[PDB]
Point group: C3
Chain length 450, copies 3
């Protein structure tokens, strides 16, 4: 049988105390709902019907690229009413899985088990045993079989003691959904059309209802507030770190590691405590990342060491380079093999050729630097007070003395040597040595305070 998905995502999320709608709060740097859409896609869903409502404009801007059917629920009249908005698109002979944009950790594997357990013309639902089931629909079983779900606000004293609860997740065929949704009313304590009434309706039709008990409680947990969200984040980060460790990445402390995107890695990679990996990051063999580093959208070659407290974004680093500590690579930084970038150095939109060193207290922006250059401490690339920002071009085997200002646009040809304290405004030729002539006054017998 084919499969499509419906994702309920219309909620305001009042207890997040936010201007965002509930499902756009992030886990590992992306909206909760994006995790759910991705899972529905990996499961092989032909269509993904996204039920949205509150924060509609924000949903559409933040999820503009998602391959979903946008189904606007103008009023939040209950979970059955939400699913019914998508029901006209259900094929009679496909399975439909109901998912929630605020329950982001549900796995493909669990959902495949749920789908496989669904009986013909019946329903499969995911349930879970909780020590404290307050708030959740209670699973009612007669002679071992599920016959109904009773919500917290509708339950009598005995039913509230039931520890097995509804996760909300269920699967049935499209025809059965249409049939039963039309028979859902709103005669209950909340005045809502409950999706949960489908269980008792199916029982009334002598159709079978199978519960699959989820064994990992956090996997099926939803987030109603940011405390719950943080619990999901920690669970997810632990899971990601455990996968990387089993793949052979040495993460010194998995509880102090964060991945917010994707990590491609070689062998014998070592990542010290308190590292954050964001966006798409690729690390070669034997890359070592020191404590406190932030890498966002970077490619790091084999045998690179990044020393502590380095922040790198949208940058490429060649093999055997050495970066840090306290180095800053801003977007467009491209460091060739065997380069050295040191403490309190900022590189922005610049290329730095093989073997070159930029080891202290330096800003290099909008520059091209060749191979085997020595960029002294305190060197700064700058511009005139003009309009746009021009380029500094330095050739191969150039020595730039400490505290030199390179005033763009300017070119320094191969083999040139620039003395310390120089202001370079004119192009420097091949093998040209430029030294600043200083005038000083010397006053003898000057006594400082005793």
């Amino acid at each position: 049988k084919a499969l499509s998905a419906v994702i309920l995502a219309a909620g305001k999320g009042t207890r997040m105390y936010s201007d965002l709608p509930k499902v756009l709060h992030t886990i590992a740097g992306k909206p909760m709902v994006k995790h759910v859409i991705d899972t529905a896609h990996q499961l092989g869903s032909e269509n993904i019907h996204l039920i949205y409502g509150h924060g509609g404009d924000l949903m559409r801007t933040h999820l503009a690229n998602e391959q979903v059917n946008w189904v606007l629920q103008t009023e939040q009249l209950g979970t059955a009413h939400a699913v019914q908005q998508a029901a006209p698109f259900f094929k009679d002979n496909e399975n439909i899985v109901v998912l929630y944009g605020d329950a982001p950790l549900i796995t493909k594997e669990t959902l495949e088990k749920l789908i496989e357990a669904k009986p013909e013309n019946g329903i499969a639902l995911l349930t879970v045993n909780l020590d404290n089931p307050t708030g959740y629909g209670r699973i009612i079983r007669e002679n071992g079989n599920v016959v109904a779900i009773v919500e917290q606000k509708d339950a009598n004293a005995e039913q509230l003691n039931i520890k097995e609860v509804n996760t909300g997740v269920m699967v049935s065929d499209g025809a059965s959904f249409k049939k039963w949704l039309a028979r859902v009313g709103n005669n209950n304590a909340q005045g809502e059309y409950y999706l949960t009434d489908l269980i008792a309706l199916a029982n009334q039709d002598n159709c079978q209802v199978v519960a699959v008990q989820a064994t990992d409680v956090m996997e099926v947990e939803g987030a109603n507030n940011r405390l719950q969200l943080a619990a999901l984040e920690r669970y997810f980060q632990n899971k990601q770190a455990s996968k990387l460790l089993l793949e052979g990445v040495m993460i010194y402390d998995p509880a102090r590691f964060d991945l917010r995107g994707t990590l491609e890695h070689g062998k014998d990679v070592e990542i010290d405590v308190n590292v954050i990996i964001e966006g798409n990051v690729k690390l070669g063999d034997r890359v070592k990342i020191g404590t406190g580093c932030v890498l966002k959208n970077v490619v790091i070659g084999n045998d690179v060491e990044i020393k502590p407290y380095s922040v790198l974004e949208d940058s490429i680093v060649g093999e055997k380079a050495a970066i840090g500590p306290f180095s800053r690579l801003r977007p467009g930084a491209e460091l060739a093999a065997e380069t050295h970038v040191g403490n309190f150095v900022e590189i922005k939109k610049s290329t730095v050729g093989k073997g070159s060193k930029v080891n202290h207290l330096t800003y290099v922006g909008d520059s091209e630097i060749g191979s085997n250059c020595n960029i002294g401490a305190g060197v700064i690339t700058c511009n005139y007070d003009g309009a746009n920002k021009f380029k500094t071009i330095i050739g191969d085997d150039v020595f730039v003395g400490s505290d030199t200002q390179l005033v763009a646009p300017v070119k320094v040809a191969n083999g040139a040597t620039i003395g310390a304290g120089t202001t370079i405004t004119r192009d420097v030729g091949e093998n040209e040595l430029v030294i600043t002539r200083v005038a000083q006054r010397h006053i003898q017998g000057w006594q400082r305070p005793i």
Copy 2:
């Protein structure tokens, strides 16, 4: 009935291996005893009798501003002897709660329940069940009712198996305290006057003793050493972080967050991992704090982003400003709206006007900078080798070229432009352009080593 409190705080705390007395070790940046004094005050205590002894001078300097009755216990002859030092101040018809300066996490709510449970002319005490009750007074019950407490060193083999123990915390009326304290002896294994003998004395008077069992074990835990203290710290920080999360603050990892003071916050505030908030901090709406930041006594306006590894103290930042990464704001830094402070920049006792940028490798101290200024990389405010430290005043719409030294006292008027590499000692006028004239030697055919 009225209420007063007695806080036992005279202990040396030998197992802390410290020159401080036991109760001055901090939790969340303040002495344990300060947490207890604050709780006693919130409970509505009319008087707070602080029993002190060891490290007396240090107690008085560190707690100089606390609204307490200073009761010096010259010799530590037992918990009953300690309370008896305060007993002459007890009103006959007020309740007295006994608390300990080394048990800082006891809450107002728990103590209100304890006070409410006290029977007329009797005692209420807080007890707790422990898996390992070694060291603690055992609660002796006959026919369900508490009749005595037996200390570890006085207990027989059977009594040592009792898992219910005394937290030390009790409430009785002032008259009953005076009565029973006078009948406490020191015929026991420690030779001490035990406050715990009040339970058996009350039973001897046919007065009722009610135990309230505390359900949160850490809440009533004391710290005898720094390992126990660290456990209390973690518990307290988790509790603070959980409260903030429920209030709508996105704390990415509550286990890597520290608050050591007070935090006022707007909505949609995001705090990344490893942030420390100290003193009194106020954050506006949509403030984002990156990893590794330290904020101590700061006010941050709406929509400010603080990028990673920024350290800020005694500073004010206006709306829509951007700070970091690797920025340092020292006391007296005042940044207006829409300002930009970048990497390896230190600002001390300076005002920076709206729209101004200070983006790299710069020190600005004792300065006033106007609106829409461009403070170049490598700029430094400095002084003559003199006595005190004078001011640099920069107007609006000033461009300060890279690597310029501004030698205070000096003024640069509106619209002025200063070239790179300049040493400014004289005042610069409105719309004055100042460019350094350099002399250079150019030597052709200079071959660097091949």
Copy 3:
């Protein structure tokens, strides 16, 4: 009885996905096998027979200084075959303890208990109860006594339910080892000579086998992959931090503290969250280390405060010094008492005398600086484009103005004063004042863009 040890360490460690052999992966900065060798030595082992094989060259380079008997196992034919390689060196009347280089946390105390429990002419082994014993040899008991070990791959369905398993660790006398090893075959599901067959062989000889049940499960755990290794690392770091806390070191959060070497400490030392201590570190009384610091091979005197995000290596800091935040001390940095090193300052192979300050945006390398000097912001020591790197010598009571370049080799004598923006190439005499003469152009009525 005497004692020697055999450490099995020949494994490839395939599931580490590494170019290193299994036992060279580190815990707390040293190879797992080094922890085991050290424990065997503290136990009083006369000989330590190291069985090695895979990654042999790497073993010999990384463990070159270890006092062990190098026993090469050319083929890994089973745990009995490994021990048999060392068996010719066993003395008949010494005890032999079998240990594993991939199980690094086993303590001297546990092994002393195991050795004491060994019956004459019999065997003592360490066992442990696991909820999931999959993979491990099951302990077979008849009438309470251990009679055999059955490996996972050889066990029937009933035996797989046994929760008591073999840790691998055992002790017997040298003569008994020789006797039983000669009778071990390889008729089993793996085709290997199992060391575990010694238990059933001993039972066949009517010799006694005693199991000592380990109560700390992590202590006896081995690491087959990096996930398991990370679990061992966290356990070990917690244990180290707990010891330091009980000794009186205030570690604000023991879960965010790492020691990778040895720490000697005074009293009232305070270490904030996310500090890493590497190599041999000594801290005096009342040393305070702020968040994010990395200290590797340093000596810190009494009353020093290291402010956040400081990185120090191979350096000495005198009493009452103040370092950080964002300070970098590279090897050979020696700071005298009452010195001050500030933000974005790098000191390398330099001495700095009593009372001197280097507070911002400065590089000092290969320098000697005297007492009570004032090294201004932006100061840099540099060299000519030459061969080797020469020294800058600054006397006592020298003022070096901001943004000055000191071009080595150069000497500045006591009491000298150097103006801001100066390039110093010639020696400066005692009480000599050196001021740069600048030429500037002033252009009035220069309007910047409106």
